[PDB]
Structure 1
Amino acid sequence: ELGAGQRPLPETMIALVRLSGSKGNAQRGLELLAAMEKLNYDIRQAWLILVEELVRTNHLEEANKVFLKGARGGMRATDQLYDLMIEEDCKAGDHSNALDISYEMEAAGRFATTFHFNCLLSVQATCGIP
């Protein structure tokens, strides 16, 4: 459709990004999400979908990669996605990303609540350095 046609309607891009995030293929996810820039389409919802599907597919490490590279790019995730991703990271013990996401969440103006600091502390308590 790109090589012998016309710009795809948004659901085409969103569906193929979802197929990536639900299958894995996160590099293909980012490649196509970056290709969405050239359509001037809203990248927010597609990126949210990609992150959510990667988390649901337990592809957490590359989900962290795409999320942090989006947040450093200045995009704001939906509050449900911050809460879920922080909780799942802390269940995985990935405080190295949980704290960074918490800083990006604060920078996005979502002030960290007692839930988020409880999640961080759950992992911090493991270090033996009180």
Structure 2
Amino acid sequence: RRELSVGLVPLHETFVALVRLFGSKGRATRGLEILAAMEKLNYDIRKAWLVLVEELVRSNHLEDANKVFLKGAKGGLRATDEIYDLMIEEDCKSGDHSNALTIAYEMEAAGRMATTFHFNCLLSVQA
């Protein structure tokens, strides 16, 4: 809170550290609060949104994980292939075909082509 009061622009690591904690504890809207900061400080949110999304799955905040990823990836935000494999499998593990299918559709929009692994995850709940 004192960083903006002084006027010093916080570091890239500074925002990275906090979003890891908020995702780890389960903060839903708190992570987005920081995401607005780099939207004003000329900093890309890709790394921060990637670690925030991944951390939310590392705890049992499955509903939070889909909301954060879908909101960020609805616009232009390429994601690493590891994240795509994680959420498609994780959503299908708990029975979230609606969330999994949307991510798979979103994944194919950004170049990456769904292979047999993604189809196998979907077929688990469709069976």
TM-score, length of structure 2 as denominator length: 0.95
Rounded Cα–Cα distance in structure 1 between residues aligned with 2:86 and 2:110: 16
How much is the aligned-residue C-alpha RMSD, in angstroms? 0.8
2:94 pairs, out of 76, 92, 95, with: 92
Establish whether residue 46 from structure 1 lines up as the match of residue 48 from structure 2. Answer: yes
Q: Which runs of 4+ in 1 moved over 3 A?
A: none
Within 5 Å, give how 1:55-70 maps onto structure 2. 55-70=57-72
* Counterpart in the other structure of 2:107: 105
Amino acid at match of 1:115: F
Where structure 1 has 5 or more consecutive residues not aligned to the other structure, the ranges are 126-130
Once the two structures are superposed, residues 62-98 of structure 1 have per-residue CA deviations (whole angstroms, 9 ceiling, x without a partner) of 1100100111012011100100111000001100100
Q: How far apart are residue 23 of structure 1 and its match?
A: 1.0
| In 2, Cα distance between equivalents of 1:107 and 1:51 | 19
The separation in 2 between residues aligned to 1:58 and 1:74, in whole angstroms, is: 27
Determine what percentage of the aligned residue pairs are the same residue: 82
Determine the structure 2 residue equivalent to 1:122: 124
Query: Which consecutive unaligned segments of at least 5 residues does structure 2 have?
Result: none
Aligned residues: 125
TM-score by length of 1: 0.93
